[PDB]
Symmetry: D2
């Protein structure tokens, strides 16, 4: 029985836990539908940028939270039943006990604070009393996912059935510079995505998920990556049904304290993996890895794991941080699927700890935007120079992010940055260099669609690097990729 609906809702002030609001029904309360991120569902900056706790509550009568972002505190008649740290993976509690009679009071308290102990991690200032994300997307929070009571081929799916669980048969493993599904040389076509819609924020959107898949099949794409967090269970099963290759990724974005900017302790900047003042996320990072792999163990669409997005991988302490997490990933994946991490700009093949730990090299490069733009010729020289050097490893290289901010509507015959023409030229140059090297095994544009971020001078009402707008309407670049991807097969490219 799904508990999804409009619940009672109130923000803490913060004299909430003192007055024991989880015992009595909330007075002067608001309304809020679940599942949904609450940030965009009321008006006013003080509500959207609220710092602290919120109180959901709903009656019951006669429990698995699919996701609660970030920190959940479940109650019943006042007695705490659960606690959970981790805003993008499910958790459940037993309720045979503590469920009195009929008319009972279920309260869910949700916290949004992010720091060096959370995944994603929150910095102390802007990346590009308040939360300051160390990541480039908005800190949507609340009960994002529902609360309920209780040969396979890319683009050519076939799932047998087996509680009933669907399953698809497929082999995936890496040989040299080749990514093989069912022993055939695959090429990744697609994007890095976001669970981002209006006004749901990060709340699950089954209609948009299907529309996203239809658009991808319209665009002749085959893959995407769950940047920068594991998606909903329903979206994963859909890729199983629809035959969409997925790269599952953990909530480990922002373990890199070189943005912006930086953080100082004693008049000196601190490194990322400083044991005393740096990140305190390791033991939670593996908790997320073992919780993720336990969830999507059997999804034939899951093809490769991503331990972290854009970490300080070329810094002191980077190897000793990721080695125990990498090993764990191979330890609990019964299929021994490839594992990787997506690398920031500035990483080279020699300095990246991913050069050894990862089966596949996954790059996030912005030659022609953050680097070199608007000089596409100079940026081409650099992209080729770094890409040649990455071939020294004899591993598959894969671009997981590359893009240019483009506001839909801006045009010029002599293109400039932020126009739709410049975006197509940016991708033309990059794709031209990608086609020169036989060890690249995929292109994944950033982003699939425009998505909301925190406010800054460098973000024009969110991140505009999508091929599509936030309402999924195509920019000119979306028709460019559709034509290019129509001549690039899934296997043998």
């Amino acid at each position: 029985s799904d508990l999804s609906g409009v619940w009672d809702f109130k923000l803490d002030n913060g004299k909430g836990f003192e007055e024991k609001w989880y015992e009595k029904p909330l007075k002067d309360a608001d309304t809020m539908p679940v599942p949904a991120s609450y940030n965009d569902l009321k008006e006013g900056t003080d509500f959207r940028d609220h710092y602290g706790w919120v109180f959901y509550q709903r009656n019951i009568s006669v429990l698995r939270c699919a996701a609660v972002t970030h920190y959940a505190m479940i109650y019943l008649n006042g007695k705490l039943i659960c606690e959970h740290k981790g805003g993008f993976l499910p958790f459940e509690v037993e309720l045979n006990d503590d469920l009195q009679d009929g008319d009972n009071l279920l309260t869910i308290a949700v916290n949004n604070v992010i720091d060096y102990t959370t995944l994603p991690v929150g910095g102390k200032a802007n990346m590009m009393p308040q939360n300051n994300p160390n990541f480039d997307f908005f800190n949507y929070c609340g009960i994002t996912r529902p609360v309920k009571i209780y040969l396979w081929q890319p683009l050519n799916a076939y799932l047998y059935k087996i509680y009933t669980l669907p399953y698809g048969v497929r082999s995936v493993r890496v040989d040299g510079t080749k990514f093989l599904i069912n022993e055939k040389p695959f090429y990744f076509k697609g994007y890095g995505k976001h669970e981002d819609t209006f006004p749901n924020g990060r709340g699950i959107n089954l209609p948009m998920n299907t529309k996203d898949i239809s658009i991808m099949k319209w665009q002749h794409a085959n893959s995407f990556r769950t940047s920068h967090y594991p998606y909903s269970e329903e979206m994963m099963r859909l890729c199983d049904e629809e035959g969409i290759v997925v790269i599952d990724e953990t909530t480990a974005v922002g373990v890199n304290l070189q943005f912006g900017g930086g953080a100082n302790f004693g008049g000196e900047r601190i490194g990322t993996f400083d044991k005393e003042h740096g990140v305190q996320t390791q033991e939670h990072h593996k908790d997320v890895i073992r919780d993720l792999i336990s969830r999507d163990k059997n999804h034939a669409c899951v093809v490769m794991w991503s331990i972290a997005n854009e970490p300080d991988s070329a810094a002191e302490g980077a190897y000793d941080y990721f080695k125990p997490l990498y090993d764990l990933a191979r330890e609990l994946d019964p299929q021994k699927r490839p594992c990787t991490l997506v690398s920031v700009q500035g990483t080279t093949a020699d300095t990246d700890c991913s050069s050894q730990l990862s089966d596949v090299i996954c790059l996030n490069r912005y030659y022609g935007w953050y680097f070199g733009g608007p000089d596409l010729e100079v940026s081409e020289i650099g992209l080729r120079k770094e890409l040649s050097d990455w071939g020294k490893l004899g591993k598959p290289v894969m671009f997981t992010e590359y893009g240019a901010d483009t506001v839909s509507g801006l045009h010029d015959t002599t293109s400039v940055m932020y126009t739709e023409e410049y975006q197509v030229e940016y991708y033309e140059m990059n794709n031209k260099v990608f086609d020169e090297f036989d060890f690249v095994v995929g292109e994944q544009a950033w982003n699939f669609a425009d998505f909301a971020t925190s406010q800054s001078l460098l973000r024009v009402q969110g991140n505009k690097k999508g091929l599509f707008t936030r309402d999924r309407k195509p920019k000119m670049v979306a028709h460019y990729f559709r034509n290019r991807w129509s001549t690039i097969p899934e296997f043998g490219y």
Copy 2:
């Protein structure tokens, strides 16, 4: 237990009922989330404009359809359990019988054909093998609403509780030219709405519903009308919680065969209420009235009933068609709430059968757009001339529709039609005349937000008359109304 999820889906070809698809599991099937309109969830004109039947199916293990648009045909292991005509109101069936063991096959067949027998009615051509709506919104179909197994004051709501059902205490009745809630002279502030979002089509959107309410409270609005169909049960309860005045309306739009255009039988145009060739919707019209009132009997937000939107009310046979439906409305409303109908342009106080049957006169006037535009001065003369004549009845007059198509982004200091400036000037002129007459008891703009329609030369990617865009972003007119409505109280204006 909510059955909402992604189901199996296929379109009929139309050799579907022959091959008995409702018995065996569907081969070569697609995917489709419910609840949602399917029209926008795949790509291609042939899918969006599909004519005929679609087949939903979902397994069961151990039934109330909140809405199925338009015609539902429920199955189980092959045996038909139900049929329902009526795309916007709930229906249920008993399932103690016919539910074998555990693993069973629930199939829902949905038809989209509209004609002179349906509400809404479908014409034979464009209003402004295919369905041609006699109404100005898109023919979204599918399982729009979920399938599940089992003193009050405006803007100041208070609902006692009482199965548990919430209830709010309030008095509503008409005295002379005054609309009184709790014996105080009310003024309607708001819009005509639509259940229209992307990509859900008409599918229920609990996030957008709350965002809509927040925007209305941001804009200092108090009311809206369920144009042109009854909304979801969840949206009605939200207006109860949030204290939003609602005008409940039936699915009776398009009982007017003077659009465009017209229909001919024997070389001669036929009237609307021709008994042989005209509308065949009467007995279904009261079925909808008795089904609607049975659903929202106790919603304190429901304040007035609307029997039909824009009917041929000044034509022969109009009185004898609406008299038995009007009487029924007063017969089954235990509160004796006011009843009305919203009148097309061209109606006068003398010729409208609503002049006698309705407690409140509800007008849809476009002085300054369809009539007179771009001459706002001439259009002002006409609006005053017709409005003065409507005062002869000593009844409350209320504008339920007035607006000008405005594409967000188009501006000029010397305004022209379709720009944001012209839209504000259009509303300034109209509102100026409204303030001259003490018998007008409300203004409701058309529309609240841009919504999808059928394609025509006169529709610029849908209906653009919204104060907000389809993604709820405000046009300049939305800030004009917010300032005007901030100085107009709920009572005593």
Copy 3:
């Protein structure tokens, strides 16, 4: 010596000619730059839509009007020196006499009234006290063009020199179904243009002219048509320098009283060439033909004459109206260049008087917009059916107009009318049928850029059929044509 600058300016009230304003300096006067259309240079609908006369004036000290739209009345110290009817071709007067001493008073009175006696002709209502154009562009008026005192190959121009006059050598003549320049089979690539910029209105814009040419060479175009009026002398010489093929056209648009709509005399609609109540433009039509050809006699870019745009050519009296004008065109063109007229939708090869008089058949067809849209398949059947029938004449057929209104920014993966995707699909279908017939010798899209029109429900802030916006920014269709035209040569296609 150029008199171009900001002059004194005032609108008549209309007690202007009584008070003899042309004698004394204008009191309570405004400012206005020449050359420019005055309509958009002040604010307010009453100024933009002004009906009647305006008064320019400027001092002199010690005369050829390049164009005065429409009717000019030149003065000096009060004494009338000139009168001119014809808003788009030059006229001059002698000034040795009437020029006293030094400080003198030059007044130019300009009228904007259009009716059945003017070219372009003004109707009595909207086409789709006030001027109501029988043409689809705005009635910009004022001193549009400056007032001053005193082998060639397409895309490969070479002009010898010869008062000094430049000249280019080239042969043009029609053989069968072939348009030959220098005895090679040409193909027209380009558009119908407009002298339309902001805020100049129709005023000459030498910067935009060069930018237009650069954009055409960027788009791999070779031709355009001076729709619907002869352009400036400077623009013609530029096409001589830049090697751009031009189709010179007269001011004869709107000699067709079947728009909208129509005009009635005695309870009955009147035909276009009714001698008593219809058009009274014939003797002025040849005055324009002999004035035009006298101006561009030597422009090597002028390749074909266009007697009228979209006339009632399949109606009674159409042949006897155009025969004396056609003959005149061949009489005064010392090069015997081809002559034609562009035909409205609904014209067939049998009924069009252009089927006999014209050397080249020039069609304005909207299969997929005005006809058939949004059914591109049905519209394709019609375009092929009419195009096949036009081949019966053994003449060259050329499309001078075809397009779909497109507001820059509107997109959908499943296209609908007014989006950028639908515009590309519209042109794809049309161009596919054009490539099936060897007797079509050119495609000219409508329009090159968005331009201002009179206000109506069918015009979304002007005409949006341009491949480019009014500020020359490209829509998606502009890159489609650039790719298609890059593979289509000038000769031998």
Copy 4:
């Protein structure tokens, strides 16, 4: 006699002066209209971003350059006649000599290089082989202005006449904290402008000038500033006719080497007024001051001089640089008009050398954008704190720049940066603080309209801080200012 037209044109390669192109007619030449900036009149980044010299040429038969940006080199039959450094003020040469017979060859060579010796000054990198402007507008170059051969009250102009020269009588002088025109306390209402249109670049646009004035009178504005360079003579006379208060400004923008960024000599950053490595513009700065004041000596609209825009005025050497230029300004202004300079963010009353030299304090502050955004509350605290401190001087304070980048079309009910709502809120906060202090004597928004800049991550297709778009269409903020300025008089506020 105006030489304005389309000339021969070619870019140097750079073997141009060797081959003596100024002697023979240019082979393989292009076309270019004058007056106009050439940068946007052809296609391709290599043309728009061309570094070096361009060659204009035009025949003559039987000379004052109104502006040539930046460096002019005039020829005739090969013999150099002139040289001029200074891209925004007129210069002339005698031609009785050197003018042979009739058919002669006039060549104008134009250079675009900017460095520490030019005004405006060019840096070595981006401010926010190539020119890198130290200013926030595009380096438009070419023959921008024409080449030719030969009581007053704000908003209530009256000019007597007096070669004939118009003149207007008015008194202007500063008393305490009051700016008085005709001994009445004035308040500046308006903006900082730019000579920026499409596609003319910085080329003179008499139509747009009049449209700009009409829009200002529509918006109830009274003043603007010639940021950041003296405008055309025609625009100045128009403000005389139309009664628009102007603040004339020199070409002295970018004398501040703290942008971005900075420049290093020997591993150390150099100060702005370093005599050896810093700016070398002083003696040219006064040449511009004495050339400017010699031009607009008699314009009654000129009300105050601006010596430089945003200089390093709080740095070592700043006082000794501006003292001789300031004194010169009072030396040659026969009216002893006030003189000032507009100050960068970060300047305080104590450290600004303008605190002593200037009669009026002119600030460029961005509280709520560059500083504090999106925290409008915190930014309000700062604006009040700095504004209170500026009152210690007992002088008039005037804001010459304040604004937020706004892309037309972006909206949200809960505003974020770059939307139209945030722009209105930004101006509401600022204007609220301005109204608290009686010593502020004007508000001038930045900018009047969107204008082109060099490309950077921080510039969304140019500078979007305009109240209007580049095609003069109003954003929502333009209607906010129109309402505010309608209640603020010219005198006595």
